[model samples]
Target: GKITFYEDRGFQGRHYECSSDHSNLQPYLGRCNSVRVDSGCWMIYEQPNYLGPQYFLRRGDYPDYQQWMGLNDSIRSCRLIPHAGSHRLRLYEREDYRGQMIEITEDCSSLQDRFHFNEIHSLNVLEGSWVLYELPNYRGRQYLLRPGEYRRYHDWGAMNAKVGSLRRVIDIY
Candidate 1:
């Protein structure tokens, strides 16, 4: 997969092409105002070492950070999400899989819409990884959900347990 980060909007200013994961981009680019994802899905961070606001992106040219729902113009790290065939996920209303339980095999725009709720405490990614959004329609904060047992939202490093939607890592189309 190929991804390029630009220091200025609309692909202007200095740019860096990346093909793999990066723990820190402090020495590569001073700031991130634009991005071009030529191939593969990626999860980018606002801080070095993969801390702070995260955003999931696919094949597209983001002329400006705003198009990617960026928290700021500070892309410090990025990782390519592995390709998974089928997707399956289970969500819990409370920590440790207690409370109400729900399972699905596809993407969801709003957990509160058909599921009748919003806050999710834990996750069980059964088949493929997913991108969890803090707001409906994949807006707000973004979190990468891998295939593992997340007993608490904290396991996913979520500062808050409020999740609005989820999408499998594979391309939506």
Candidate 2:
């Protein structure tokens, strides 16, 4: 995938092109005022080495920082999200896939309202790609998931075990 970052608004000023994942962008560009995802999906971080707040991006043009839902213009790191084939997920109330469990094959807008639980400590993604949101209705911090097993919240890079919603990544075009 290809992405471009502009130092100024309206896609102006010094720009940096990213064709792959970047653990740190400070060396190439001091800060990112705007960004454009020419292809594929990406997750941008506010701190170096993929730490701090994260923002999700799909194929689109972001002329300014706000368009990407960024609270600030500083973006320190970025990673690409590969597209997958199918989608299947199992959420658990405790670590290592223990405790109350629920299988998911479709989007869930609010886990709390549906499952009566606000925390998801473990999970297993059987297929495809998915995105987990910390708040209901697809709002708040997002975590990308692929086919694998997440034994704990930290295994999925989540600061907390709370998962309010989830949805499969379906390519529309």
Candidate 3:
């Protein structure tokens, strides 16, 4: 994966290029006003060492901070999202993949409306990668998941046990 961060909006001023995960960006750039994701997906953190609010970004050009839904022109850390083959996921209302469960292989814009539940405490990702949104129709906080088993919300670093929507990570190019 490759990405370039600009200190000024519209790809101007000083810049820093990265092809791997960065736990702290202060050594190279103090802040990031814009970004250009040349390949793969990425997650940007508001604080160093991957702490604080997180923002998910796909392969694209974000000319300004607004394009990435950033509250301000500041990013202290970043991680590249790896691609996982085919998509198959199972969501559960209780931890360890127990309790009420639902299997999904395609995009679900409103999990509450379809599953009649809003809390997802556990999950099993059998294949590919996925993005889970905190609100219905893909709005709100985003969480990235790879092929694996998430025993509980905390296992995936979620602040809450609520999941409103889900989508497979389909490669666009």
Candidate 4:
């Protein structure tokens, strides 16, 4: 199967970005989907920004229970190691689907849950296409939408598709 990420730019023609959905980020989501029967794990890739070296999370350590928790509460704590340029977090799973929402805290005490498709960003599965958006109060440097499968990026300059009545979280397989 192939993953196709697209944007419905209203008056503008739709932009279709497709790629093979095979990478280190697959195991996390693939394990959740139960379609992949491999024992391999996924790796975390931190590129451009070298705050910390990339790491891996095994399925054995996760077990069946932890995998379920990761589906909802996958947030983990980490010290911010200073890097030179922009910090980029690249998570890969073998052939699974994963949704990432990041929240950055200015101070250690204050914390905020960044909402996707509402506060920080929004996503929707339209017909057979998926759309993305940049929400208000997005403090992050920017959204990175490099050429890849199962990934989408929407910035202010491009409001590919407006929020229609069918705004809801669609299930992934």
Candidate 5:
């Protein structure tokens, strides 16, 4: 469980590597431009405290912020995703887990194609973790979903509930 944040481009700036989330690392926010993950999976955020566009990352090198699959250099905070031993998720159209519900255990390229809708206001990550994409076919934009109950799109650090696709967070090699 190791992750490092670089303040400069990639290898030049002062950095801080951690085995946990970046919540307590005050100076580590707002200026990150590059990252290096020695091991474990991660969920990086554009806004701090796990907010805004999420990027799922594995052990690798991101020469810059855009390399994390975002539209810009908006990295601010991050979280270490736990091991994905098993997986299941239930998406809902209403808050508090109400309205229509749909269960999923594997990746889905098109949510609207299956649910007839694009928005999911609530979520129940019954097990493991997943990433919700903003585009159909899971081509881009990621929102990390760990095992928990989400009552609003904000629960997953999103202002929009218009989910387009999904993918399970399997242990990456």
Candidate 6:
């Protein structure tokens, strides 16, 4: 959701369309596109740095050298951030929050099954926070939540029942 300024070039190469040699400069951190700000004058956003590109630049921040050695081409340079409200999931309660009686439970598939975690919550699609999970039970059974009904919780139960496998939520927009 940030704004960037870019001038147009007649015949430029695609951002992140790196050469096989890995020597070319990587694209900017966000999405790229051209918008005509005025007559014949356009503003371009080069290589969108948001989730729309799946955290491409953020992945380069990894500490491990081989973190991307065998990843798919699209994911080779993917950027990933931690889930927002991560600690709020309450996998376990510590002394500081003692006697609070946190009732957060895992879903039927043994994943965190809280209303916020299982379905829509403020932190659900948070920016810069993505965590990958393995749900052999939920493979091939993903569905998109309708935009109009996004805030409802009924659909959450349906998605949770499927055998989810390798679920990764990225901030692509």
Question: Which prediction has the highest TM-score against the true structure?
Answer: 1
lDDT by residue (1-173, candidate 1, tens digit) is 88999999999999999989999999999999999999989999999888888898999999999999997899999998888899999999899999988999999999899798889998899998899998899888889998999999878878889999898899642
Q: What is the TM-score of each candidate against the true structure?
A: 0.96, 0.88, 0.89, 0.19, 0.84, 0.24
Off by over 4 Å in 2: none
Which whole-number lDDT from 0 to 100 does residue 49 have in model 4? 28
lDDT tens digits, residues 56-79, model 5? 888989998777766676677778
lDDT of 2 at 124: 95
lDDT of 6 by residue, 1-173 (tens): 22121212221223333212121123442222211111111111112331111211221122221221212223212211223322222221222223223332132243444322322221122222222222334332233221122222223223233223223333333
lDDT of 2 by residue, 1-173 (tens): 88888888888888899989999999888778888788877888888898877887888888877787677889999987777776789998799988988998999999989889899999999987788999999888878787899999998889999888998876532
For model 3, residues 1-173, the per-residue Cα lDDT tens digits are 88999999999888999999999998888789999999878888888888776778888999998887787887999998777666899998798878988889899999889888889999999988888888888778777787889999987778999988898877653
| Top candidate when judged by lDDT against the true structure | 1
Kindly list the per-residue Cα lDDT of model 4 for residues 1-173, writing each as its tens digit: 22211121121222221122223332222222111112322222222221112222322333332232223222221111111122222222211324453322121111132222332233221122111222223221222222233332243223332211111112221
Order candidates by TM-score, high to low.
Answer: 1, 3, 2, 5, 6, 4
For residue 149, give model 3's deviation from the true position in Å.
2.2
Regarding TM-score, does 4 or 6 come out ahead?
6
TM-score of 3: 0.89
Order the candidate numbers by lDDT, best to worst. Answer: 1, 3, 2, 5, 6, 4
Candidate 3 residue pairs in backbone clash: none
Off by over 4 Å in 1: none
Which structure is stronger by TM-score: 5 or 6? 5
Backbone clashes in model 1: 0
Residue 153 in candidate 3, Cα distance off native in Å: 1.4
| Residue runs of model 6 more than 4 Å from their true location after superposition | 1-47, 52-71, 75-86, 90-109, 112-134, 137-173
- Candidate 3 local Cα displacement, residue 42, angstroms: 1.6
